[PDB]
Design a protein around this ligand. Structure first.
Ligand SMILES: Nc1ncnc2c1ncn2[C@@H]1O[C@@H]2COP(=O)(O)O[C@H]3[C@@H](O)[C@H](n4cnc5c(N)ncnc54)O[C@@H]3COP(=O)(O)O[C@H]2[C@H]1O
Ligand SMILES: Nc1ncnc2c1ncn2[C@@H]1O[C@@H]2COP(=O)(O)O[C@H]3[C@@H](O)[C@H](n4cnc5c(N)ncnc54)O[C@@H]3COP(=O)(O)O[C@H]2[C@H]1O
Ligand SMILES: Nc1ncnc2c1ncn2[C@@H]1O[C@@H]2COP(=O)(O)O[C@H]3[C@@H](O)[C@H](n4cnc5c(N)ncnc54)O[C@@H]3COP(=O)(O)O[C@H]2[C@H]1O
Ligand SMILES: Nc1ncnc2c1ncn2[C@@H]1O[C@@H]2COP(=O)(O)O[C@H]3[C@@H](O)[C@H](n4cnc5c(N)ncnc54)O[C@@H]3COP(=O)(O)O[C@H]2[C@H]1O
Lengths: 349, 349, 349, 349
């Protein structure tokens, strides 16, 4: 959805004065045809009759004016009401796939002028926004909340399964018994979880102010998921991979590519044919995930540790003395690494 | 519910153009009587007057036409609108249990012609679909979402209890202190959980496109439950049982038979009279569940392991050398089996 | 709420044909005044004019008849429609606190005849049922579902807190460091949880068929809570207490008495003044809870074990030989008791 | 929101007879203009015509009277209905930002008389309450329940994350490996959780009787959170801090100040510049949290223990003999402290 169009959508999103007025118009079953222009004098060819108002905008004024037949003309920033009860006359030759005089008029005028035109039928509760060659149907909050609440509840389920796969993989990592199947399975669920987030995003935006709690819920649920997926990619990719490259891997599986077993294993650098082979491939974590998230060791410094010990397994066997031989690790970071790992092994395994 | 009827239901399920039109008809309180035929010329005996249109179908056209009294005649694939404002005259002698001219007309015409007839009253919000001798009442999405959301919330509860019973049984299995009561109790909850899924299924289908999130939620919640139940049956049945036979046991308790303690113990091969005897019967897991789900050993190969060690208890005491004496188990699978079991015992017990 | 009245409520609960008709009447904004009698000939003094029908009842017939002014007279079992469009004339001297002719008429007639009278106003969506001197207002399903869904969600919260208190008490029990405060705190939450269940019960009943999922949810959530509370009472009461007596203690705190710290400690047999003293009183579990729920030892036999070992602490130190000296405990039950306890200590502590 | 205004809001909150009447007025689309005064005789200058009633108030009476045009005059405590169908004539010169005769009249009269004036338009479902220079818009229960249910669901998410941070910090505390980052992160989530509670509070109040379940849910979810945050502040502040001072720290971050890392660390007494330095600062718990919440040692006595051992780490190494050297700790409290700590270390680490 183009950004130039997303900007216009904000104009009638829950929270704005304009939307408050449109909600009331809908509740009263009045119809509405609103034309947003900047220079009223320049549309004497498409705007006919009505009353010249040139007054300050307000939700109550718009509502009251919508009681009359015809269209209302507002300024682009919704600060002035220019005309009311006007007859809009766009070029009849302009193609339109709309039905009815009001919507056909709205699409034609928007295409002809490159301006925003809002239409509301008397019987229905949707707001149709036309801008240039675009058409966006805005829904009432109740419909949006139902979809968003369902999506969140769905996300909770995926997240619960992600957490179980993660704790299981954690045990396998600490014991160095991880297979490519385990890794890919965890990444797959992580990619599916973030995809759901991406798909509900437009619903959230459209909710405007009414989407505050929904946003907070999405944040609490998916907080550090992205980072976690990036660290897993770095820890299990066939060959050393830069963080940015890992983040790009993530972005691709979250939008373009499809998170299938073989496909994920393929992008990780493993030449696998059948998904049954995944259980056959053994892999050892580099150690980034634990070093950063648990030992609180910056990636730039974690590279150094991996460069020397190569795997988490070796890192877990290294003494403080051993660890201090690494650039960037003093008695403090050496203790943190050593202690955080020995603590997890004892508690988890 | 016959499949030939489920096909017709899809025609007016959320997502289709036809349903979009019917939703609008309902919202406007217009009534509707739609007849779906393939060869319009062949019904001159039941179709009278009106206007011959023979035009391409669209939701807006259907809606506009429903403003007139009478019936609308569409093509079976909903691509053409043949007539509008017609008088439908089915045989008056045909039996009908419907009330009112419109619904009695619809049921008679559907029975007389073997075709689909859709009726909508002006005052109510349900869609009545008649086909041959069938009648299916389709509900609005809001009603369906309420029932489905409740069922899912209910499933979450059953699943939480299933998970607790499973972790408890896991401890008992690793310690070899399982009784027939423990097994049957876990299977019972598992059968009750899947039954709920089966009962909400028609609601999900009827939701059409609006049932996407609901489906994803059901999948995340019951993902590997079926497999798990089949493996339990294989591990605790009185005598060795094939997977297919286990899957058939599952299908029966999920639809036909009732998951009562004694009944489940009976089908497992145990001659028990009172449910109080279940706590008295000791049983030892064959080992399939752990071998497949944890060691990732294919059932065909797990049979071999069980054939030799007979029980999970013995399998847990076998060394890698011991395990490698089995056909299909090399140093890799022997390690996986041995390590995965010793890890669970240490962590869980 | 009297049972004789609960019986009449069932007549118009979701699921019945009568309620289906009333729902439609409400949806159409028609009013309704229904009189349920067994012998129509015997009310010529309160029933005037209208049409004598004496026909079989059906939802559609009732609905159609409600289009006329006046009242409808049905048979008590809702199988016949006796009159329609009648004028009901109860004694004007009978006291009534209702407003409007229809509701004042309904209450007077119900009091005068001891029969059921149902009233529905044209503008509102509630069903008012009058029977003798009772009046019950039945609500639409949507209102009931909202309250019930909220209550269940609330129960989930109390249950989560109950579970945390229980696992904490479990640790304390296995270690024999329980104080009267710990016990009372757990019982209090358990009494509050079951009370909520008792308060939502009428809402559930009133939901009729539409309350199936709600019931299943309440069952899964509070399944073995009652038993658990009874066993705790038996394990921590100051002096040995019979099961029935424990169940009566439970029933009282779930309805009559208020679950306050001191009050619960008082009824347990402990003479405590301030709630601050609770942390000062040390108590040792008899062992019933663990013996029955974990070792699967019947209470009649558990009494024997307690009679000899006195406390769970001693029971946990007893060998199989020691345990077998008890009446009712053989090598099987001795092993179960010994093994189940040693397993919990190892896993939990 | 001023308390003098909150008092007036209660007058029309769900549960009151007045609100029951207003809900009905709204459902019937009747309008309403209600004036609440104590001495009717004293407003002959703003009250004109209508009917003098001087009768007892009831919901049905108010409803019936609202069918007439004009205003209704009630007594301040809602016990009497003084006038009906009156013309209200407040001073036209008084400033008003309202639209329409009814709302402009209501705001003017409330400002002019310092009394409560309630306005309801025929088309909308909100109740507008005017009092002196205040204006409060009351919403229907369905709107409030949706917001409250969302907020609670959001709180559940924050609480789940708080619990995970707490268990993680618990491990770090028992092992004495806590950094200022860990502490601040936990406090931040705790401050964000309580803030949400504070923001939903007005919605809860406005729900009146319909907010009972909502309140119970908020209580179960945030039960001992405040105490826990206060104890953390006491355990990790740079210098010894009194409980009251800790509670004041809490109140500030829950309303005035913003819970940002550096800001929280700053108020704790640590001179930190960048949030990256937090991971660099090591801190040791005083021991209050564990002493009070786990050992059940009063803060007044816990001060003594800390005064001597200084840190939880030292407290965990102290023998019963060592602990008994402290004022206020006998064999009982010494055992509780020693045993509760050794139990946590064994179970958690
Ligand atoms: N060129 C044409 N071709 C065929 N029929 C025509 C027509 N012009 C007017 N009508 C018929 O008259 C109806 C009502 O016209 P009206 O101006 O009151 O009431 C109108 C008007 O207030 C507004 N509206 C529609 N087009 C407009 C425009 N170009 N400019 C300003 N307002 C418009 O929307 C209302 C409803 O529109 P709707 O089509 O549902 O309803 C239309 C339509 O059935
Ligand atoms: N054979 C008969 N016996 C008794 N009464 C008769 C009748 N034929 C017509 N009516 C009376 O006239 C009403 C309205 O007829 P209408 O054609 O406008 O309005 C009709 C019509 O547009 C449509 N409809 C019903 N039957 C139809 C049919 N066989 N073919 C096409 N349209 C039909 O449904 C609308 C409402 O039907 P509804 O029964 O509620 O309402 C009926 C009914 O009360
Ligand atoms: N004794 C009386 N005193 C004062 N006013 C009187 C009255 N009798 C009749 N009315 C006035 O006439 C209105 C409509 O009478 P209606 O019979 O059409 O329409 C009635 C009638 O169909 C039904 N209904 C009420 N009482 C009934 C009864 N005793 N028997 C059968 N039907 C009754 O409920 C409808 C609405 O009742 P509602 O009171 O709202 O509306 C009443 C009321 O304002
Ligand atoms: N001074 C004035 N300036 C301009 N127009 C005037 C006016 N006085 C009356 N009207 C016009 O008459 C309409 C209806 O008057 P009404 O008394 O029936 O019906 C009224 C009345 O029952 C009530 N209401 C409004 N102001 C009131 C007041 N000061 N005292 C008592 N009742 C009032 O609210 C109803 C609707 O008010 P609404 O303004 O929507 O509708 C008003 C308005 O369009």
């Amino acid at each position: 959805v183009p950004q130039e169009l997303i900007e216009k959508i904000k104009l009638i999103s829950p929270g704005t004065e304009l939307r408050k007025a449109l909600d009331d118009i809908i509740n009263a079953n009045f119809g509405a045809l609103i034309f947003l222009v900047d220079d009223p004098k320049k549309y004497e060819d498409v705007i006919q009759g009505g009353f010249w108002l040139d007054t300050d905008f307000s939700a109550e004024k718009l509502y009251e004016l919508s009681k009359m037949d015809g269209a209302i003309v507002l300024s682009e920033d919704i600060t002035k009401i220019y005309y009311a009860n006007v007859h809009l006359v766009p070029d009849p030759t302009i193609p339109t796939g709309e039905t009815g005089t009001r919507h056909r008029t709205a699409e034609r005028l928007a295409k002809q002028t490159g301006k925003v035109v809002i239409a509301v039928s008397r019987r229905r509760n949707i707001i149709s926004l036309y801008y240039k060659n675009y058409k966006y149907v805005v829904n009432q909050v109740d419909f949006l909340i139902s979809k968003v609440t369902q999506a969140i509840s769905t996300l909770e389920k995926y997240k619960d399964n992600f957490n179980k796969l993660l704790s299981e993989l954690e045990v396998l990592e600490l014991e160095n018994r991880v297979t490519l199947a385990d890794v890919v399975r965890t990444l797959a669920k992580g990619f599916e979880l973030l995809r759901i987030v991406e798909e509900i995003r437009p619903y959230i935006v459209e909710l405007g102010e009414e989407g505050r709690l929904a946003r907070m819920q999405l944040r609490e649920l998916t907080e550090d998921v992205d980072d976690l997926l990036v660290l897993l990619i770095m820890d299990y990719s066939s060959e050393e991979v830069e963080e940015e490259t890992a983040q790009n891997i993530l972005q691709d599986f979250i939008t373009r590519r499809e998170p299938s077993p073989i496909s994920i294993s393929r992008v990780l650098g493993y030449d696998v044919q059948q998904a049954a082979q995944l259980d056959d491939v053994l892999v050892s974590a580099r150690g980034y995930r634990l070093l950063k998230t648990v030992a609180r060791i910056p990636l730039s410094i974690g590279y150094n540790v991996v460069r020397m010990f190569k795997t988490l397994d070796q890192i877990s066997k290294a003494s403080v003395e051993d660890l201090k031989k690494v650039e960037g690790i003093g008695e403090k970071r050496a203790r943190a690494i050593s202690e955080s790992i020995s603590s997890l092994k004892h508690r988890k395994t």
